[PDB]
From a paper:
These include a H+/drug antiporter module that recognizes structurally diverse substances, including antibiotics. These tripartite complexes comprise an RND transporter in the inner membrane that acts as a secondary active H+/drug antiporter extruding a vast spectrum of structurally unrelated drugs through a periplasmic membrane fusion protein channel connected to an outer membrane channel factor across the outer membrane. A comparison between drug binding of [name] and [name] [name] is made via activity analysis of 20 [name] variants, selected on basis of side chain interactions with antibiotics observed in the [name] periplasmic domain X-ray co-structures with fusidic acid (2.3 Å), doxycycline (2.1 Å) and levofloxacin (2.7 Å).
Doxycycline appears to bind in a congruent manner to the DBP groove as reported for minocycline8,10,18. The carboxy amide group of doxycycline interacts with the N274 polar side chain, while F178 and F615 sandwich the aromatic ring of doxycycline. Interestingly, we observed an additional electron density at the DBP cave of the same protomer, which we assigned to a second doxycycline molecule (DXT-2). This second binding site represents a previously undiscovered binding site for tetracycline antibiotics within the DBP, where DXT-2 interacts with the side chains of S135, F136, V139, F178, Y327, M573, F610, F615, F617 and F628. Largely planar, heterocyclic compounds including doxycycline and levofloxacin fit into the DBP groove and upper cave region, interacting efficiently with polar side chains and hydrophobic residues of the Phe-rich area.
Residue numbers in the entry:
A (entry chain D): 6 to 8, 13 to 165
B (entry chain F): 15 to 166
C (entry chain A): 39 to 329, 569 to 864
D (entry chain B): 39 to 329, 568 to 671, 678 to 864
Amino acid sequence: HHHDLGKKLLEAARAGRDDEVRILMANGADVNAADVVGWTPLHLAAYWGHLEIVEVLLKNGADVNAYDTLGSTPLHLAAHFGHLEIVEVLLKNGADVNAKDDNGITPLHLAANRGHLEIVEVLLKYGADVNAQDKFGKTAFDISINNGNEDLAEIL
Amino acid sequence: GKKLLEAARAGRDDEVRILMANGADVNAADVVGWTPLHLAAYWGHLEIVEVLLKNGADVNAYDTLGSTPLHLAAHFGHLEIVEVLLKNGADVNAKDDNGITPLHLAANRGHLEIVEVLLKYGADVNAQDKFGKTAFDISINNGNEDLAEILQ
Amino acid sequence: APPAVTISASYPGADAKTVQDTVTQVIEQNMNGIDNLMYMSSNSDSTGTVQITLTFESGTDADIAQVQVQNKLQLAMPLLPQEVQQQGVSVEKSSSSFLMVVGVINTDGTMTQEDISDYVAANMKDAISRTSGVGDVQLFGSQYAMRIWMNPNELNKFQLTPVDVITAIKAQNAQVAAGQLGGTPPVKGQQLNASIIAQTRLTSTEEFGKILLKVNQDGSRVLLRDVAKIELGGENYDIIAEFNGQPASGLGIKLATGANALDTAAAIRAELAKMEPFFPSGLKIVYPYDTQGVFMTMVQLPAGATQERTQKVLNEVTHYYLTKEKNNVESVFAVNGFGFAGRGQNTGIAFVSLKDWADRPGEENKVEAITMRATRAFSQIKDAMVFAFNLPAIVELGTATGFDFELIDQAGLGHEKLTQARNQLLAEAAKHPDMLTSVRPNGLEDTPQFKIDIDQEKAQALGVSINDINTTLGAAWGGSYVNDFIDRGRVKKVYVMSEAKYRMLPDDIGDWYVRAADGQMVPFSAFSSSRWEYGSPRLERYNGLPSMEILGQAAPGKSTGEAMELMEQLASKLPTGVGYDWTGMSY
Amino acid sequence: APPAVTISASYPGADAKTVQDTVTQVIEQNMNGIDNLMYMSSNSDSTGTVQITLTFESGTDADIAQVQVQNKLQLAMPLLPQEVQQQGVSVEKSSSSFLMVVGVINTDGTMTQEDISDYVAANMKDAISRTSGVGDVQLFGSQYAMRIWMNPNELNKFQLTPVDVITAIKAQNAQVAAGQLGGTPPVKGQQLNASIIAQTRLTSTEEFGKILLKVNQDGSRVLLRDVAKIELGGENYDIIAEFNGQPASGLGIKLATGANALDTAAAIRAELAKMEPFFPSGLKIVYPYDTDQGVFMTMVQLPAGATQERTQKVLNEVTHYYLTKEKNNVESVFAVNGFGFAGRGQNTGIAFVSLKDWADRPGEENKVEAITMRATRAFSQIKDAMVFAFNLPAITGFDFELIDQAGLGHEKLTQARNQLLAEAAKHPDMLTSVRPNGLEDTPQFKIDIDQEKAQALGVSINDINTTLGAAWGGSYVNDFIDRGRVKKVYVMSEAKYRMLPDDIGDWYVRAADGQMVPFSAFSSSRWEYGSPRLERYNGLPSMEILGQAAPGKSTGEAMELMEQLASKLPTGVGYDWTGMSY
């Protein structure tokens, strides 16, 4: 899971260039090409919220559960930054809903921290362990108490 | 009674007596609880102290922190006014909210003349404040040799 | 108009004496060796503000004068309190009067006065301040700060003081320089190079609310929102403006010395045109004072008057223009807390704009007739000086008929004896109506102040440090500038201060606790005592010595020199050590 | 040309946002009351550097503009971090282009690049900087500092942190004012008057090595050399230069606004003649850039994130081309890695090219114009690097600024920039090469300190952030004396303990109870994206955009389209014309 055209694809997937990613995928570019920090084109597409590119890469066999060098997956990034549509599609294609990074942080933790209520519901819907704790022993509910998010604490 | 508070402060004897001839409250107070007797004793207007007391001014009036017009006169070296207040019945041992007596304020400023008059009227030389200090401790802490021996 | 350079400094929570003795005097003692300087004057206010005015001979280059004043001020800067340096000391070369007032309102009523004032400070004031020819910009309101309103009951419940709050805010609202991975010099062959990002400035009340103050031994957490209310609010709450009775803010703009008034006005409007398309919904610029067609009304209540009482008088002034003169008056821009004589809870000003010249036919509908009737009607207002005046027309009268007198303490007599000497001169001047009319002080009267004495022996015996006592007292009752934060991409201040209800009455002093060295909480009453006394809310100084400005006019017929001559005679009989000089017109 | 005053400041180890939010905004907010200011622009870099450019109306006295800016900056100095004040801030009134480059090499090869750079910084730069007409001097290198390269393993072994090292250096590298024997006022009959001499600045690596950190409970001593390597080394290591492939340093000199270019160059040459007789053996001055022209420049810009090693490879091929293909035309190449035409960074470089005598380059194909374009074409086949050669005297399409007018923030402004960039690409008949002038966001390492865990263990957050910053960013501790000259002392982790994310966990902080706590016990980390360079224009966040009119189209026509394109941008995004387009 720790992964020129492969480097062309990573730049195209970041800037949202839907035509060029189709061009490079049709020319044998590596779908799972990683940069120096371990981010794949799926990582960058999930980070910068490019939904169409997400679906294109997973169609061509992109590792939905790719790890970066700190253990973070594209579902971590999508849940952290409020990209609900991508969070859905990632879970559709077998994204580990309980993936922990090196800190023990799950996508539920990140969605809870930034208060993305709808994403928290989609993650729970797919079986996210509501009692998963990070390295500091914090659950998604602990995060809502410290943040004062009464709406989140009720959803949980 | 606000105009009399202003009158007793600026030191205008003539205005003041117009006000009680017109019936202004001799015990009127501003927001800090200072009667016209307080104001006259502070700025050292002897004539108004005498006139106000003549018209029934509360000689033991307190402000919001328990200070009397005798405290102000003893503190600021008004020997003429401490006499006039003590003859009219100022509590020579009056304590404010901090346990400070006019003997404390007089001893601190080195007003040895007022210290004698206070003692003569029955000032408790052993009176302490909230910090347990007496007028003698003040004389020792200030280095006032003469004031120190007047309290034995 | 002789050119004048102005030094302004701020000391939050400081009284007039503290300002004068820790800021004003240090600066003034260095204001020598400056070319073409005629005289120097200063005010030190219990608003915590000082203004030093240095007036130069006509023909002096304002650029050179500002440079020479600032170079002497640099000698004093390292001696000034850090609280004063942090507020930003300003040196300006501007006219004393307003060239124009830019008003800002929200026609949809979806923004409070506090909201409008912050929008103007954060999106409008700076670009105007950088416009060439703009010598000074006065905000009629205050930029938002992050306000931490402390609760002394909750702080005592958790053995916490404002010192702990201030310390936690400095630690947890921080911008950390953390280095890089793969920075130079690297191990050769290094591929990765990335900045390390650690803590960054907090950006919202939510973030400040969850600053961690302490962990109890049982594991529970004490957050900042548990001991304080947290909200955006003005750096200060002293200046509040209204436009035709509706909430408003604005910029008072003064012209830089020697700058062209028409060119500068055009640059300001051109700069405003750049910002309008990005206003939020409902915000609108209005123009309540353009420099006849306009005039001002000053409002001066006795020292000690609250902002609520000043607002009542401004309401009466605004009512008059909006009802009695509604056929002549186009708009009123009233400012509470800012006056002709500076800033304070007991002053205010109204800018009045009239309708078209052709829309006001008749003798009785011109500025002089209107201001005369207004001042006569405002003569009725008691416990407040209210005067309506068109600025160029009273300069003319004063210049031709008035004088400007300075009573100077030249022997260390002190403020109280200088007051006594002033009153002796004022009462004697009242005995000569044939030569002098309305001899009056330009300053303020002494007011009751709350004097608190920290018993050093009790504090040492209990293990309570003086720094903690003074920080707790000053932060709670005066407010304390802690550090900066980022509000919507703009650096702004963070202030801690008691919530209002715990800093209103003298018995609230006892509600505040300081933690001793051994951990015990000690109330303020255990090591302090207090009493009422009188003191000044505005200490004046002239040419570096304590002073009291006295104004007046010659009697009908008698010349200015005859009125000045009698003042000098009267002055010669004042107590020893009291001198005098002539300033302003009389110079 | 309208005069420009430049403010420069540095914050060692700070990222671009830290620089912008503690320095740049503070200075901008206090640039009021200055006459004839046209506009203001700023860059805040992840090298820890801010540059603010104040451009004034044509005809403005540059002397007056500089003084007014300096005075306003003086009043704002107490508002800046102490770490920035103590680096010294500069305010200059000079052209943006170089008047000349003074190159220094060692013919005997007995001095390395860093030796030469220190010699120039310590023996040459200051006298050049004081020459009349010299508006700015760039050192192509760094002055030596006393470098304390900390070892986290040995620090933990003796239960010490960088805080302990910094405290001991300040205590034992000190200059003490101690008074006099028989000082005034004296007793009567005093016969002896003499200065008391207490501690004095250390002067050598050996003196720093024996700074005493602690005495163990058994009696043994822990010296600074037991937890660190101590050596002379540059204040920073970002700028290295070469002259025809050989190690070199030098001074880039810019002409002060309004000075005479010829008179200033002659004064510089006369100053250099005074220094030459005292050079160490082998040291020689070369003159690789003196302003056909006979000279030109070549700029190298790699994508943000590129290392110094990779930029050096690109500079090598640029130099190689001039030293082989243009053998008969090129006299010299002075190449600088880490310094660029605009700004400073590990991903930028510049080469100054000097041509042989005009008489020895006959033919139109051997003149500056034909050579520079041949070079640009040859360098256009270089992968992932913008490389082109150009000219610039000692004293064009359009220049466009996208402005955040409503507090939108960096991410939203980037999106609006990209939206406008894609729209301009769909009009190739009118606009060409519409591109951003700035840098793209790059991966950064976001570390979160857990306040609860730190307090639960009794670890002070100040000790944590000092340990992190001193180890990975470096810290200016105080000054020392190197061969009679005041220079700086820096502490920082030795390179091999600050290269990889795993190294974070090798650093320990001492808790109140005396226990050592690793960074992993109270911190967590993740990758994210952020800006290596933040721009502002007239006090608001901004993004500069360059472009040119298409062939057979007027510049005013191209600017008309850009304005119409910008009007359809998201709410709160404004724009302004600047520079050539003003």
